[PDB]
Design an enzyme around this catalytic site. Structure first.
Site, PDB file in Angstrom:
ATOM      1  N   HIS A  85       7.459  11.827  -4.076  1.00 55.53           N
ATOM      2  CA  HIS A  85       7.569  10.500  -4.661  1.00 55.53           C
ATOM      3  C   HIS A  85       6.404  10.342  -5.620  1.00 55.53           C
ATOM      4  O   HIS A  85       5.613  11.268  -5.841  1.00 55.53           O
ATOM      5  CB  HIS A  85       7.739   9.361  -3.649  1.00 55.53           C
ATOM      6  CG  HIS A  85       6.577   9.077  -2.771  1.00 55.53           C
ATOM      7  ND1 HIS A  85       6.337   9.763  -1.601  1.00 55.53           N
ATOM      8  CD2 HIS A  85       5.646   8.091  -2.838  1.00 55.53           C
ATOM      9  CE1 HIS A  85       5.266   9.251  -1.026  1.00 55.53           C
ATOM     10  NE2 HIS A  85       4.841   8.233  -1.756  1.00 55.53           N
ATOM     11  N   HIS A  87       3.610   8.376  -5.834  1.00 56.44           N
ATOM     12  CA  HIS A  87       2.268   7.947  -5.500  1.00 56.44           C
ATOM     13  C   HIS A  87       1.257   9.100  -5.658  1.00 56.44           C
ATOM     14  O   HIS A  87       1.613  10.288  -5.674  1.00 56.44           O
ATOM     15  CB  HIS A  87       2.207   7.377  -4.095  1.00 56.44           C
ATOM     16  CG  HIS A  87       2.893   6.062  -3.939  1.00 56.44           C
ATOM     17  ND1 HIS A  87       3.353   5.618  -2.728  1.00 56.44           N
ATOM     18  CD2 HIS A  87       3.081   5.043  -4.805  1.00 56.44           C
ATOM     19  CE1 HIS A  87       3.867   4.416  -2.847  1.00 56.44           C
ATOM     20  NE2 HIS A  87       3.690   4.032  -4.096  1.00 56.44           N
ATOM     21  N   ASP A  89      -0.852  10.489  -3.715  1.00 58.65           N
ATOM     22  CA  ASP A  89      -0.919  11.506  -2.672  1.00 58.65           C
ATOM     23  C   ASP A  89       0.186  12.580  -2.824  1.00 58.65           C
ATOM     24  O   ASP A  89       0.196  13.551  -2.069  1.00 58.65           O
ATOM     25  CB  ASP A  89      -0.917  10.886  -1.284  1.00 58.65           C
ATOM     26  CG  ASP A  89       0.305  10.016  -0.955  1.00 58.65           C
ATOM     27  OD1 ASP A  89       0.784   9.269  -1.814  1.00 58.65           O
ATOM     28  OD2 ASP A  89       0.724   9.992   0.243  1.00 58.65           O
ATOM     29  N   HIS A 150      10.014   4.402   2.254  1.00 56.29           N
ATOM     30  CA  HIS A 150       8.641   4.168   1.858  1.00 56.29           C
ATOM     31  C   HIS A 150       8.547   3.822   0.376  1.00 56.29           C
ATOM     32  O   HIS A 150       7.699   3.017  -0.027  1.00 56.29           O
ATOM     33  CB  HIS A 150       7.846   5.427   2.204  1.00 56.29           C
ATOM     34  CG  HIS A 150       6.514   5.460   1.558  1.00 56.29           C
ATOM     35  ND1 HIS A 150       5.413   4.794   2.056  1.00 56.29           N
ATOM     36  CD2 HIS A 150       6.090   6.059   0.432  1.00 56.29           C
ATOM     37  CE1 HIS A 150       4.377   5.010   1.268  1.00 56.29           C
ATOM     38  NE2 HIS A 150       4.769   5.773   0.278  1.00 56.29           N
TER      39      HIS A 150
HETATM   40  C1  LIG Z   1      -1.679   6.907  -2.292  1.00 55.71           C
HETATM   41  C2  LIG Z   1      -0.915   5.838  -1.522  1.00 55.71           C
HETATM   42  O1  LIG Z   1      -0.806   4.762  -2.445  1.00 55.71           O
HETATM   43  C3  LIG Z   1       0.194   3.851  -2.248  1.00 55.71           C
HETATM   44  O2  LIG Z   1       0.990   3.951  -1.352  1.00 55.71           O
HETATM   45  C4  LIG Z   1       0.151   2.702  -3.241  1.00 55.71           C
HETATM   46  C5  LIG Z   1       1.145   1.741  -3.265  1.00 55.71           C
HETATM   47  C6  LIG Z   1       1.076   0.705  -4.172  1.00 55.71           C
HETATM   48  C7  LIG Z   1       0.029   0.627  -5.077  1.00 55.71           C
HETATM   49  C8  LIG Z   1       0.048  -0.583  -6.026  1.00 55.71           C
HETATM   50  N1  LIG Z   1       0.138  -0.369  -7.472  1.00 55.71           N
HETATM   51  C9  LIG Z   1       1.122  -0.771  -8.359  1.00 55.71           C
HETATM   52  O3  LIG Z   1       2.118  -1.330  -8.017  1.00 55.71           O
HETATM   53  C10 LIG Z   1       0.867  -0.418  -9.862  1.00 55.71           C
HETATM   54  C11 LIG Z   1       1.514  -0.577 -11.074  1.00 55.71           C
HETATM   55  C12 LIG Z   1       0.925  -0.091 -12.257  1.00 55.71           C
HETATM   56  C13 LIG Z   1      -0.337   0.553 -12.219  1.00 55.71           C
HETATM   57  C14 LIG Z   1      -0.999   0.713 -10.990  1.00 55.71           C
HETATM   58  C15 LIG Z   1      -0.401   0.284  -9.823  1.00 55.71           C
HETATM   59  C16 LIG Z   1      -0.785   0.203  -8.313  1.00 55.71           C
HETATM   60  O4  LIG Z   1      -1.801   0.664  -7.904  1.00 55.71           O
HETATM   61  C17 LIG Z   1      -0.978   1.578  -5.044  1.00 55.71           C
HETATM   62  C18 LIG Z   1      -0.910   2.626  -4.128  1.00 55.71           C
HETATM   63  C19 LIG Z   1      -1.657   5.398  -0.256  1.00 55.71           C
HETATM   64  C20 LIG Z   1      -2.965   4.926  -0.313  1.00 55.71           C
HETATM   65  C21 LIG Z   1      -3.649   4.559   0.849  1.00 55.71           C
HETATM   66  C22 LIG Z   1      -3.034   4.650   2.089  1.00 55.71           C
HETATM   67  C23 LIG Z   1      -1.716   5.123   2.165  1.00 55.71           C
HETATM   68  C24 LIG Z   1      -0.818   5.309   3.244  1.00 55.71           C
HETATM   69  C25 LIG Z   1      -1.086   5.101   4.716  1.00 55.71           C
HETATM   70  C26 LIG Z   1      -0.806   6.108   5.650  1.00 55.71           C
HETATM   71  C27 LIG Z   1      -1.100   5.873   6.980  1.00 55.71           C
HETATM   72  C28 LIG Z   1      -1.641   4.654   7.340  1.00 55.71           C
HETATM   73  C29 LIG Z   1      -1.986   4.334   8.796  1.00 55.71           C
HETATM   74  N2  LIG Z   1      -0.897   4.434   9.755  1.00 55.71           N
HETATM   75  C30 LIG Z   1      -0.890   5.620  10.560  1.00 55.71           C
HETATM   76  C31 LIG Z   1       0.244   6.585  10.241  1.00 55.71           C
HETATM   77  O5  LIG Z   1       1.494   5.912  10.099  1.00 55.71           O
HETATM   78  C32 LIG Z   1       1.455   4.772   9.235  1.00 55.71           C
HETATM   79  C33 LIG Z   1       0.337   3.768   9.505  1.00 55.71           C
HETATM   80  N3  LIG Z   1      -1.921   3.709   6.445  1.00 55.71           N
HETATM   81  C34 LIG Z   1      -1.654   3.924   5.154  1.00 55.71           C
HETATM   82  C35 LIG Z   1       0.340   5.828   2.650  1.00 55.71           C
HETATM   83  C36 LIG Z   1       1.660   6.143   3.244  1.00 55.71           C
HETATM   84  O6  LIG Z   1       2.073   5.431   4.185  1.00 55.71           O
HETATM   85  O7  LIG Z   1       2.420   7.011   2.669  1.00 55.71           O
HETATM   86  N4  LIG Z   1       0.187   5.919   1.328  1.00 55.71           N
HETATM   87  C37 LIG Z   1      -1.047   5.494   1.012  1.00 55.71           C
HETATM   88 ZN   LIG Z   2       1.995   8.517   1.595  1.00 57.85          ZN
HETATM   89 ZN   LIG Z   3       3.583   6.730  -1.020  1.00 56.98          ZN
END
Ligand SMILES: C[C@H](OC(=O)c1ccc(CN2C(=O)c3ccccc3C2=O)cc1)c1cccc2c(-c3ccc(CN4CCOCC4)nc3)c(C(=O)O)[nH]c12
Ligand SMILES: [Zn+2]
Ligand SMILES: [Zn+2]
Length: 232
Positions: A85, A87, A89, A150
Site C-alpha cells: 500500500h 504508506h 512503511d 487498513h
Molecule cells: C507509516 C504509517 O503511516 C500511516 O499509517 C499514516 C496514515 C495517515 C497519515 C496522514 N496523512 C495524510 O492523509 C496526507 C496527505 C497528504 C500529505 C501527507 C499526508 C499524511 O501524513 C500519515 C501516516 C504508520 C505510522 C505510525 C504507526 C503506524 C501503524 C501502527 C501499527 C501498530 C500499532 C499498535 N498496535 C499493535 C499492533 O496492532 C495494531 C495496534 N499502532 C500503529 C501502522 C499500521 O497499523 O499499519 N501504520 C503506521
Molecule cells: Zn502499516
Molecule cells: Zn499503512
C-alpha cells in the site's frame, strides 16, 4: 537468538531477517513516526537465483540496511519489489531500491495515492487487481486485493510453495488491542475484506502481519474482532 525480533530489540536503522519457511523470510525494521517508535515487517521470497522483495523497510536508510542484510545473510540479488500500500512503511525506500537496480511495482491505486501524499512512487503498475477478490501471479507469489481495510489499496501476498500468507497492514498481530493507524482505513469494510482473505486462503499455515509477530490463521479472525470493537 532465534525468537521473532521485537521493537525494543531493533535500533532504528538496523534490519533483521527471520526465516519463515524454505525460501521465505520476513524482514523487520523500526522507525520513528510522530514521536513514537514502531516495528514493521516485510517479506523476501526466493525466485530461483534472485529474490522478490515485498515492502520496503520504512525509510531510505533502513532500506539500504535491508539490502546489506540480504547480501550478508542470503547473497542473492533483489531484482523486483512490490509495495502493498501507499504508506511510508511500504514505499519509503523505493528510491533507494530503484537506484540499486531493483524494479519497483505497486497497483495503480497505490501509485496514485503515494504520489498525492508525497510518498515515494513505485515505477511499474500492477494491473488486474482493481476489484476485490482479484488475484494475479508475480514470480513465486500470488497478489490478492481483498477490498478496503487498513487502506483502500492494501494488497495481500500468498506464497503457495510454503502456504505463507503475508497480510500486510490489513492484518494485525495477536497481541494487538487496537486497529493501529486507522487514518486511511475503512472500518466498515475491513471485516468483509478479511472474510475474503479467509475464504481465499484456507490452507495458510503462517500469517504475517504488517507490524508484529507472525502466527497462524487466528490472526485473521483476531483482526476482524479488533476492528469491529474499535468501530464499536
Ligand atoms: C507509516 C504509517 O503511516 C500511516 O499509517 C499514516 C496514515 C495517515 C497519515 C496522514 N496523512 C495524510 O492523509 C496526507 C496527505 C497528504 C500529505 C501527507 C499526508 C499524511 O501524513 C500519515 C501516516 C504508520 C505510522 C505510525 C504507526 C503506524 C501503524 C501502527 C501499527 C501498530 C500499532 C499498535 N498496535 C499493535 C499492533 O496492532 C495494531 C495496534 N499502532 C500503529 C501502522 C499500521 O497499523 O499499519 N501504520 C503506521
Ligand atoms: Zn502499516
Ligand atoms: Zn499503512
Amino acid at each position: 537468538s532465534g525468537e521473532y525480533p521485537t521493537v525494543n530489540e531493533i535500533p532504528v536503522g538496523e534490519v533483521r531477517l527471520y526465516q519463515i519457511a524454505d525460501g521465505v523470510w520476513s524482514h523487520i525494521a523500526t522507525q520513528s513516526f510522530d514521536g513514537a517508535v514502531y516495528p514493521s515487517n516485510g517479506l523476501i521470497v526466493r525466485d530461483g537465483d534472485e529474490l522478490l522483495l515485498i515492502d520496503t523497510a520504512w525509510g531510505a536508510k533502513n532500506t539500504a540496511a535491508l539490502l546489506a542484510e540480504i547480501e550478508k545473510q542470503i547473497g542473492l540479488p533483489v531484482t523486483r519489489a512490490v509495495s502493498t500500500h501507499f504508506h511510508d512503511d511500504r514505499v519509503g525506500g523505493v528510491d533507494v531500491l530503484r537506484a540499486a537496480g531493483v524494479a519497483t511495482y505497486a497497483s495503480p491505486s497505490t501509485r496514485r495515492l503515494a504520489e498525492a501524499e508525497g510518498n515515494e512512487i513505485p515505477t511499474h503498475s500492477l494491473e488486474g487487481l482493481s476489484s476485490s477478490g482479484d488475484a494475479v501471479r508475480f514470480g513465486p507469489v500470488e497478489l490478492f486485493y481483498p477490498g478496503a481495510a487498513h487502506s483502500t489499496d492494501n494488497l495481500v501476498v500468498y506464497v503457495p510453495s510454503a502456504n505463507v500468507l503475508y497480510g500486510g497492514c490489513a492484518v494485525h498481530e495477536l497481541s494487538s488491542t487496537s486497529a493501529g493507524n486507522v487514518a486511511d482505513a475503512d472500518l466498515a469494510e475491513w471485516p468483509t475484506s478479511v472474510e475474503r482473505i479467509q475464504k481465499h486462503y484456507p490452507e495458510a499455515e503462517v500469517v504475517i502481519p504488517g507490524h508484529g509477530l507472525p502466527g497462524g490463521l487466528d490472526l485473521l479472525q483476531h483482526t476482524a474482532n479488533v476492528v469491529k470493537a474499535h468501530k464499536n
